[PDB]
Design a protein around this ligand. Structure first.
Ligand SMILES: O=C(NCCOP(=O)(O)O)c1ccc(OC(F)(F)F)cc1
Ligand SMILES: O=C(NCCOP(=O)(O)O)c1ccc(OC(F)(F)F)cc1
Ligand SMILES: O=C(NCCOP(=O)(O)O)c1ccc(OC(F)(F)F)cc1
Ligand SMILES: O=C(NCCOP(=O)(O)O)c1ccc(OC(F)(F)F)cc1
Ligand SMILES: *Cc1c(COP(=O)(O)O)cnc(C)c1O
Ligand SMILES: *Cc1c(COP(=O)(O)O)cnc(C)c1O
Ligand code: NA
Ligand code: NA
Lengths: 253, 394, 394, 253
């Protein structure tokens, strides 16, 4: 949680937005994934959103669906993901790290135990894709008990009650799915908003920041670069670096 | 907030992405409104009677129980239009879709039976039906796929994941999240996120209601137990519902044991699985120690749902209903026995329920008991499966 | 001498070897006795209701008649246990067999449907059933043959002659001539020697009786016409019977036109055959100029009887009933139309009746008419046949 | 008809029974069939029963069933059968010739026309297999109008009414299917009885005559000799001659 507060305060002082890439942990392999992540950070990522491979990602499109499949082909497990997370945090002490999870992986060995493990390895936030605010109580409570920010999705058509709930329950940042919503969220003192879904070009990043959002999240665009360069690990990193630096540049003032 | 309780004890809930909550809330409200609307009830009753063929018979099987003190009746859902109980609830959901002003239907299917049921209801009621089916199931269920297309439904193969049911379910939801204003997701069992477990039960409860009236007329008393197979839980909860408050009536659900519980190749998550959160609900499921969802195995494709309806998990937890399992071989023996002794070819799914009733009778032949088995469907569709197996063994 | 008239005008009779007359006389007497026996009627009614699923629905098809002044209802025999009307009369004949103290059943079958019906009735009522089937039909109807064996029936392939239905019929009779003391010959249509045309009609007349009651309840008047396909004539006479004295109700029988009457490849002996004596009766039949019996062709195996029931020939001769024909292509179009517009897959046999009703509607769309089509059976069994044809044409 | 009366009177004067073989016309071919028939007569046949190939002989066992099939394979038609009959009569003026028919072949072009054709070629009797006495009126009337004897089957269990009917309606001979019946038939002045069905050995012929029958009919036994010697036409006739002479010998006093 604290890492997000520090990041946004610093970004605000520089009058710039945050660029947050998403990738699936272990895709296409543990080693290459760790290299991919270090490249994303070196290229300009302000924070990271990381997915743990799940057998049935019913909230993800084809690109991410295949990312999970590649991870599974590599034998990636949640346990190995937490080992990767521990190392990533050991290498990068201040970058906020957020996880994108599916409820069963959090509930599996106990909700409290999951968030305790997150805190132990240095994770900052957790967004559980298939847990609506209506079912979030045990998750956000366990998150807060372990200093983990519970992230909530704010649909573009969310009514006033939902906006108030997301503003009250969330921490770290509010995940805004792709002006009025952004203003309402600020009015209810919600966590800074990061726009996600379909963000694949620099102009979209600048547009998000111009609309009042604190930054933007890009996943499929990043993962597409991975799957199109599977046969060329070196070219993969080169293209990832080029894309991230371009996207991050668009967030600066 | 919701109008109805989304939980049955600790089980159930609405574990779906925030974007789908409006669709579930809309559906719940339409359902509540429809249930207190005499016109909706009259239209549903009319379709069930004049199109589907309700009420279905309650057949006494005297030959199969000879030499014992067991009296066995079969609730004939195999005589329902379509050949299975699934028809009851798809008609109800189709009417709900129209009540909400929707003209499109989205459905998922594994063995293809729900797909066929959804297709026939959509054809009758003028709805544009699109069905998601795992590519693996599409190749294994050529007959059902052709039936769906004959009835004007669009069948879309799903390759993602293990390319099976669970994968078809995920794809159906993705579509719905962006089309619920004009399309209704016709879930095919008493599972998934609220309000589906409740809606499917209510649109299947005529099974138990008719059974009660028929058994009282024929025997002058209630059954000692009603028995039904459990894949997702719709035909079982449909039979159980009206008897829940009749404490003297045993409720027995039968999960598929596959090659045997000890082999790990089965489909009995309620009694041998572990509670998890998936398919939009908290319920017992087939999963790895890590929390990855697995598949249920059964000679009967219709019972291959890796989880189970939340109300069944609840009824089990409080001891109101008991759940057991029946293996492939026990189900096959029941299938052959009904064919030869009563001239009725049962679905392999239903054969699991019959097999357990036969066990209750055979294990204690002098025990006086009145049993009703829900014959959820006909087995003409399983002829090839049974034939190949029998031949394979000479 | 006989108790009942063996003739319908010039048609009918008992043209069998002298040795079989005692069997026919015994059967006629048992039938007459059974018809005035309240206990027999009660037992038959009980089986029809609680085992077979009667009464069957009368479904109004609003989608298919849109834009016209035709109102169409389908009598749902497809919902009967077994999937076809054949079940009604086999249950009645099985009871007659038992009334005569017989424990064995002999049956003939072509497409295998009557064989399956005879097998299920025999299994239910504890009768030893043996079925004669042409070797050619045995190879083409693997599914039905397995169903018969699953139900405990002994299936005997017949190679003699063209190894088809007519050949199976001859073999069944030969057996019966030497075993009628303990075995009953369960003829499968309203044809053959007296008393079969009469018995089969009476054991199928509930179709028309229910239709009359149902149409009066729903429309407050009788149909302008009732339409049924005619292979041997049982489902048609079953529908027609109760309406014969209602002169305002048209009776329309539909024979299969195959590839077209002019091609000679059809199964319409009533209107395009020539009267002859065969199958123990005098009736119109498919025959060479020399008098050798030929075969009826139709995309639907169930309508391949080279002759027709004598009462139909009679009703036609006096102008009480009208008979027409429908080609393979017209039947196929009706099959596809019902699937897509009403969510009901009709048997290809029944599709011939529907096709003619569709023609009556389409040819004169502004003609006000209330029609009832006898949906003699379900078409799940014809899926492969229709699929192969459609594919063969791209 | 008259030929039967003359035959039985002559046989009675010699105190012997009649031996009557049956064969299907045209089996296995027109030419060989004509030779077969001449051999049967030369070997001792007192009369003949001849079948006209029919598509569905539901009153015949396997042996005869195959005889019809062989005839059809040879393209034998009823018209060709009548041509054969005309020739057989032209060669043998006194031997009674009886036909075994199925109703449709008689009814086909008109019942009266069929019997007129029988009279024209010299046939003496006609037994219509699938026409019970109860349906025989038009057939026996047409037969008598053309001096053709209508033959009727007398089942071994026939009741008194049937015996009286067969005795009254039949002419030529009464076909008795295999003591009391024979005596009853004579009491009702029925046509002389010929026992048929299963007659395949000399002892059966002597037994029939001893029981009071005027003779015996043998078909399957004769036809079996034909089908077992199809590949050897000459041997076929030799064996037919041997069988018939043995059977006829058994009928003599
Ligand atoms: O963060 C993820 N998406 C990142 C970018 O989206 P895209 O750039 O289009 O792949 C992401 C986050 C939450 C999620 O669950 C739910 F839909 F329910 F909210 C699914 C995907
Ligand atoms: O409803 C069931 N799946 C629900 C998936 O749950 P969710 O997608 O989470 O709502 C389900 C599974 C199989 C089915 O029919 C058949 F076997 F015939 F294919 C019908 C429904
Ligand atoms: O009854 C019919 N044949 C009668 C033959 O007449 P006969 O043997 O002279 O009494 C007859 C023909 C086909 C049939 O069923 C099926 F198509 F399914 F095979 C049932 C009966
Ligand atoms: O004359 C024929 N049989 C000759 C000898 O019988 P077999 O020696 O056993 O072939 C013969 C005669 C009549 C007949 O029809 C019916 F059965 F109805 F009477 C069938 C066969
Ligand atoms: C679909 C099916 C089942 C399994 O589903 P439930 O939802 O558990 O009832 C059982 N029997 C038949 C015949 C089916 O088609
Ligand atoms: C057997 C059959 C028929 C044909 O027989 P009829 O005796 O003419 O009725 C027609 N429809 C179905 C479905 C059949 O199975
Ligand atoms: Na299950
Ligand atoms: Na016919």
């Amino acid at each position: 949680m604290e890492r997000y507060e520090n990041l946004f305060a610093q970004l605000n002082d520089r009058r710039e937005g945050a660029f947050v890439p998403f990738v699936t942990l272990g895709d296409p392999g543990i080693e290459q994934s760790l290299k991919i992540i270090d490249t994303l950070i070196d290229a300009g990522a302000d924070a990271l959103e990381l997915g743990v491979p799940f057998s049935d990602p019913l909230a993800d499109g084809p690109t991410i669906q295949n990312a999970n499949l590649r991870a599974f082909a590599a034998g990636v497990t949640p346990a190995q993901c937490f080992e990767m997370l521990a190392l990533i945090r050991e290498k990068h002490p201040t970058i906020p790290i957020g996880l994108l999870m599916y409820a069963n992986l959090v509930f599996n060995n106990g909700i409290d135990a999951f968030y305790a493990r997150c805190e132990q390895v240095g994770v900052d936030s957790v967004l559980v894709a298939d847990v609506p605010v209506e079912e979030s109580a045990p998750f956000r409570q366990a998150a807060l008990r372990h200093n983990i920010a519970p992230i909530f999705i704010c649909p573009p058509n969310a009514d006033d009650d939902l906006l108030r709930q997301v503003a009250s329950y969330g921490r770290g940042y509010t995940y805004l799915l792709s002006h009025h919503l952004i203003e309402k969220l600020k009015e209810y003192h919600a966590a800074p908003a990061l726009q996600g879904f379909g963000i694949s070009s620099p102009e979209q990043v600048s547009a998000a920041v111009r609309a009042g959002a604190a930054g933007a999240i890009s996943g499929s665009a990043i993962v597409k670069i991975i799957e199109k360069n599977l046969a060329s690990p070196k070219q993969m990193l080169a293209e990832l670096r080029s894309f991230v630096s371009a996207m991050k540049a668009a967030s600066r003032a | 907030t919701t109008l109805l309780n989304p939980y049955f004890g600790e089980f159930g809930g609405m574990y779906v992405p925030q974007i789908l909550m409006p669709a579930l809330n809309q559906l719940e409200e339409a359902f509540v409104r429809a249930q207190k609307d005499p016109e909706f009830q009259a239209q549903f009753a009319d379709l069930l009677k004049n199109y589907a063929g309700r009420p279905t018979a309650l057949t006494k099987c005297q030959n199969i129980t000879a030499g014992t003190r067991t009296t066995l009746y079969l609730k004939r859902e195999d005589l329902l239009h379509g050949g299975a109980h699934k028809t009851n609830q798809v008609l109800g959901q189709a009417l709900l879709a129209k009540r909400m002003g929707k003209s499109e239907i989205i459905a998922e299917t594994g063995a293809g039976q729900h797909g066929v049921a959804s297709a026939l209801a959509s054809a009758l009621l003028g709805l544009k039906c699109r069905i998601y089916m795992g590519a693996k199931d599409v190749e294994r269920q050529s007959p059902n796929v052709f039936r769906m297309r004959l009835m004007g439904a669009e069948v879309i193969p799903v390759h993602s994941g293990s390319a099976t049911l669970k994968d078809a379910c995920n794809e159906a939801l993705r579509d719905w999240s962006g089309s619920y204003e004009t399309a209704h997701y016709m879930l095919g069992t008493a599972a998934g996120p609220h309000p589906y477990p409740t809606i499917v039960r209510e649109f299947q409860r005529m099974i138990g209601e008719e059974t009660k009236a028929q058994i009282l007329d024929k025997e002058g008393r209630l059954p000692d137990a009603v028995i039904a197979c459990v894949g997702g839980g719709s035909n079982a909860i449909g039979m159980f519902a009206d008897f829940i408050n009749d404490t003297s009536v045993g409720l027995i659900g039968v999960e598929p044991g596959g090659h045997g519980i000890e082999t790990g190749e089965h489909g009995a998550p309620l009694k041998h699985g572990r509670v998890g959160i998936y398919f939009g609900m908290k319920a017992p499921m087939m999963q790895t120690a890590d929390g990855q969802i697995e598949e249920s195995y059964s000679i009967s494709a219709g019972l291959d749902f890796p989880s189970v309806g939340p109300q069944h998990a609840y009824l089990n937890s409080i001891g109101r209903a008991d759940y057991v399992s029946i293996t492939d071989d026990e189900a096959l023996e029941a299938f052959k026995t009904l064919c030869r002794h009563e001239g009725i070819i049962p679905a392999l799914e239903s054969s699991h329920a019959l097999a357990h009733a036969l066990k209750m009778m055979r294990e204690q032949p002098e025990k006086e008991q009145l049993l009703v088995v829900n014959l959820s469907g006909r087995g003409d569709k399983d002829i090839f499966t049974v034939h190949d197996i029998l031949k394979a063994r000479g």
